[PDB]
Nucleic acid binder design. Structure first.
Lengths: 99, 148, 193, 203, 58, 51
RNA sequence: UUGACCUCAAAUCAGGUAGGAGUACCCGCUGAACUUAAGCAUAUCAAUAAGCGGAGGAAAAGAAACCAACCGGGAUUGCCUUAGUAACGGCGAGUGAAGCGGCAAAAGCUCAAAUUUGAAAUCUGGUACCUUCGGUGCCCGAGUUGUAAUUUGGAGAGGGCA
RNA sequence: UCUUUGUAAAGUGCCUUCGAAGAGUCGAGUUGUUUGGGAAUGCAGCUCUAAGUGGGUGGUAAAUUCCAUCUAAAGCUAAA
């Protein structure tokens, strides 16, 4: 992303000897841990699925994933949350019942 | 001051410059721009044509710093050289010693070619140049260097 | 109510505006009281300046990116580059900013040289009892002024390589305008069965 | 520790164990008074992260709020105004139900200062909250310099001015371009931009 | 924290605790970690062995 | 909120101040203004800095 | 039978605290219409008056889930300005910010989530004494459903060396 | 001027293993109110309801791919 030195175009703006500063420890809030992977997987085996999550694994097996993403978009907020939910339900089905 | 005011000249005379028949009232034709399409139409057309209606597209969150590009004509462009060096650089009109003119630090975004620089070679540090501003600068023996 | 060739005015006085008129009669009075507040602060903070050391920083938004302004604080990498920690530098009167980062080596070098120049011109009195009183300077922005960096030279050789600058700008605007369409054509042709 | 396991487990409110607990507890809380003292937090980590510490002078009060819209007064639905102000039924009450919970608890135990509150349960009619309050006259709070800020006179009735977390939410207090009308207070910004400032030498 | 480190040799668990969410994960975690566990009657009886009032786990 | 103070351009205030300082010269304007200066030697005049 | 524990009470129990006033300014709730639109109903008046709850010498806000699209800036507040502008509006009457920039003042931070585990190290209270906006000894109590120390994202923690 | 607090506390460098970060919340739909905020600026009621290379934001709804910028749902803080 080095710039050109002229005012328009793709990489518009002044050429500057770049520094690449130190990475902040925020921007790593999304990194899970060794610990919280263990806690969330042990709460998942105690809690189990939800009434809409139990329905989602029926729709995946009996009607495919386009019908389950359409439902999970209605259940959860947005569509990009429905993508991450149906794959997690695909991580449920593929891990347990098959192998 | 109120001493020099024509309200000191209507003392004694009844209607204070407002007429006997007219009888200056509070709001005889509305309030403000009231009735521009109905009873003030002959004033709206004829002195304000184009008032009512919609033209063009909206710009949500317009910032007038994106559009900052003040123009400088080829008319001046030597005012950005100081006067003590202006007569020095005007004479000895030659390359290898040519005045670098920082038009952005002078506060301009665009150079335009309105007319007739002297035949001295100059170096113009610009962001945007027109066609004719570049042609006349190069016809004097100079270049324009685009900067950001 | 609309009669003459007069411009259409927009006077926003249809509310109860007269209940919220703030005339500033105390401009002189607040000026005097503000100077008295600065004098009292300079008395309490008796050897120190009234302000902290601020950094050279580059203003945003192309209207102002040609200008160098005083910033808020000195960005823990710049503090560490001048050989002192952040918590100590806060007590020596250097303002420190954790949010601002270093992506520009010229501004970095300017601020580190500001820090060396500040350390080379102040004396810190040792903690216990000595205190050799030495005539406070009120402004640190006066002694260490924000200097606008020079960018070029007054005289140079005219180097006409042949190519235009207007065509350079018009090709840059053209190249930016059609990048996605040329990538679309690259994908549609790279789908050659 | 246990608080991470509880923090993750109180997120699965649709699982069988939590909905059985919610049914039993929503019966039990419904059987008691509307505002009644809780002996300990039912969500000890959610209380703990909202500022609670199990020392003397930290008090938990459970409270019950009626759900739904705010029906307007002015009898027989007659508003006597323009047809826009004629709406009686679908009006929505700009404070939260949690803020009304905090208000009723801070009114009953007025010697205590409302620190926070949190959701525990709900049924059709009632939402259920627990309020953590601090005792500013207890010597376990007037010392312990982490918490004696609440003994200042400016934090009298933070829930009645809107200074809690749900109050600073429902007052719109946030940084952003999305919060321009009420970033430093709604009426303060309105008064600031609806005044006429005249100088001595008129600009 | 001792069960997660596989350092406890026996875990007695009360059955009386009024928020049961404090201790419902204590069987399952003990089955995950290989720590043997016994659910015993009495948080009060656990508190007597440790000179508290109640202790809810030991 | 009536206007009390009045803006004057600074160059105009300096014009008037220079005209006033220039009028502290020859004693026709000084005599016409009051100022019993009929018997001092010069019109405006100075004095040693001891004062 | 006895001693606990949990929960819930009672007392002219030991010690405290709240109410009311004032409310110019401050933090919220609730909330009009006259008016203007030359009618009037959306709009305007106005997120105002009246009503209600709650503080202080200031209050609030406040150390970014910010602004930006730069060569990037850097808590909050306020003044000049942006600007009667972008935008909203029977696109009618009318309404209407914010970023940048100059200045005033400048200040930073701390909990929850970590096993102290080779020693609840923490704290209210009672009583005795003293150098009393408190300290120390002793003793009940709070507390392991977690009080201290450590850590707060700018980081930081555990090992090894310097 | 008097105690020495203390076989106490704090800060700096290198290597390594890590790095816990807030839920009927965020977000979504709808309703009402409000905003200059315009396929919805904020708030609130109800219904649904998360994740962890995640989430919010980037002023035109949506899908796909990138990038940039902060680190919410807990809290304190003089001065102008």
């Amino acid at each position: 992303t080095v710039k050109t030195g002229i005012a328009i175009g793709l990489n518009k703006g002044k050429k500057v000897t770049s520094m690449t500063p130190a990475p902040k420890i925020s921007y790593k809030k999304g990194a899970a841990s060794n610990r919280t992977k263990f806690v969330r997987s042990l709460v998942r085996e105690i809690a189990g699925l939800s009434p809409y999550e139990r329905r989602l694994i029926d729709l995946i097996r009996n009607s495919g994933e386009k019908r389950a993403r359409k439902v999970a978009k209605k259940r959860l907020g947005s569509f990009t949350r429905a993508k991450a939910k149906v794959e997690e339900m695909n991580n449920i089905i593929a891990a347990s019942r098959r192998h | 001051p109120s001493r020099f005011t024509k309200t000191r000249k209507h003392r004694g005379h009844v209607s204070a410059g407002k007429g006997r028949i007219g009888k200056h009232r509070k709001h005889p034709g509305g309030r403000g721009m009231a009735g521009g399409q109905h009873h003030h139409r002959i004033n709206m057309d004829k002195y304000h044509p184009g008032y009512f209606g919609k033209v063009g597209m909206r710009y949500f969150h317009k910032q007038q710093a994106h559009f900052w590009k003040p123009v400088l004509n080829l008319d001046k462009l030597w005012t950005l050289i100081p006067e003590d060096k202006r007569d020095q650089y005007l004479k000895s009109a030659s390359k290898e010693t040519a005045p670098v003119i920082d038009t952005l630090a002078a506060g301009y975004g665009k150079i335009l070619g309105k007319g007739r620089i002297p035949n001295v070679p100059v170096i113009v540090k610009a962001r945007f140049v027109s066609k004719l501003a570049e042609e006349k600068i190069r016809a004097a023996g100079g270049v324009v260097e685009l900067i950001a | 109510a609309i009669s003459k060739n007069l411009p259409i005015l927009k006077n926003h006085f249809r509310k109860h505006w007269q209940e919220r008129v703030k005339v500033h009669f105390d401009q002189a009075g607040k000026k005097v009281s503000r100077r008295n507040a600065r004098a009292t602060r300079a008395a309490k903070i008796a050897p120190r300046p009234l302000d902290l050391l601020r950094p050279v920083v580059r203003a945003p938004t192309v209207k102002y990116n040609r200008k160098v302004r005083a910033g808020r604080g000195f960005t823990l990498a710049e503090v560490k580059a001048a050989g002192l920690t952040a918590a100590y530098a806060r007590t020596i009167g250097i303002a420190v900013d954790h949010r601002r980062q270093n992506r520009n080596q010229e501004i970095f070098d300017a601020n580190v040289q500001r820090l060396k120049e500040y350390q080379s011109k102040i004396i810190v009195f040792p903690r216990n009892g000595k205190a050799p009183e030495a005539e406070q300077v009120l402004s640190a922005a006066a002694t260490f002024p924000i200097a606008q960096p020079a960018t070029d030279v007054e005289a140079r050789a005219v180097q006409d390589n042949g190519e235009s600058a207007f065509r350079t700008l018009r090709l840059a605007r053209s190249e930016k305008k059609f990048r996605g369409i040329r990538e679309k054509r690259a994908r549609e042709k790279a789908e050659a069965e | 520790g246990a608080y991470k396991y509880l923090e993750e487990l109180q997120r699965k409110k649709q699982s069988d164990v939590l909905r059985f607990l919610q049914r039993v507890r929503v019966w039990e809380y419904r059987q008691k008074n509307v505002i009644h003292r809780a002996a300990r937090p039912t969500r000890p980590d959610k209380a703990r992260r909202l500022g609670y510490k199990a020392k003397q002078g930290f008090v938990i009060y459970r409270v019950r709020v009626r759900r739904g819209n705010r029906k307007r007064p002015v009898p027989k639905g007659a508003t006597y105004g323009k047809p826009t102000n004629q709406g009686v039924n679908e009006l929505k009450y700009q404070r939260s139900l949690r803020a009304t919970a905090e208000e009723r608890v801070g009114r009953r135990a007025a010697n205590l200062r409302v620190l926070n509150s949190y959701w525990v349960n709900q049924d059709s009619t009632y939402k259920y909250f627990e309020v953590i309050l601090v005792d500013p006259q207890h010597k376990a709070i007037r010392r312990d310099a982490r918490y004696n800020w609440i003994c200042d006179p400016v934090h009298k009735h933070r829930e009645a001015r809107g200074l809690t977390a749900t109050g600073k939410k429902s007052r719109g207090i946030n940084k952003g371009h999305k919060f321009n009308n009420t970033k430093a207070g709604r009426r303060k910004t309105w008064k600031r931009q609806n005044t006429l400032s005249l100088w001595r030498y008129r600009k | 924290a001792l069960i997660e480190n596989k350092k406890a040799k026996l875990v007695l668990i009360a059955n009386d605790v009024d928020p049961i969410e404090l201790v419902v994960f204590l069987p399952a975690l003990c089955k995950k970690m290989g720590v043997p566990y016994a659910i015993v009657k009495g948080k009060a009886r656990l508190g007597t062995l440790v000179n508290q009032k109640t202790s809810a786990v030991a | 909120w009536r206007k009390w103070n009045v803006k004057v351009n600074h160059n105009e205030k300096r014009y008037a101040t220079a005209s006033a300082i220039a009028a502290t010269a020859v004693a026709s304007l000084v005599l016409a203004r009051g100022h019993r200066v009929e018997k001092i030697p010069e019109i405006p005049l100075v004095v040693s800095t001891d004062l």
